[PDB]
C-alpha cells in the first residue's frame, strides 16, 4: 500500500480503495519490475506483462 508508484518516489500512500501494490512482471533481460505501484489490475498473465502483487507494503 505505502507503495512504489513508479519507481525513485520510493514507498507513500495510494487513495481509496486501490489495495494492493502491482508491477509489470517482466522477466526477460533481468527480472525487470516495468512500473511499480498502486492501480488494482492485478492478476492473469500475458507473456511479456504477468504482475507480481503484493499486499504486504514491501515487494516493491
Do not use: E
Not at 517482466?26 to 507473456?47: A, E, F, H, T
Amino acid at each position: 500500500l505505502k507503495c512504489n508508484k513508479l519507481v525513485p518516489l520510493f514507498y507513500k500512500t495510494c487513495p481509496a480503495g486501490k489495495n494492493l501494490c502491482y508491477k509489470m512482471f517482466m522477466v526477460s533481460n533481468k527480472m525487470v519490475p516495468v512500473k511499480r505501484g498502486c492501480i488494482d489490475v492485478c492478476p492473469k498473465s500475458s507473456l511479456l506483462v504477468k504482475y507480481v502483487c503484493c499486499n504486504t507494503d514491501r515487494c516493491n
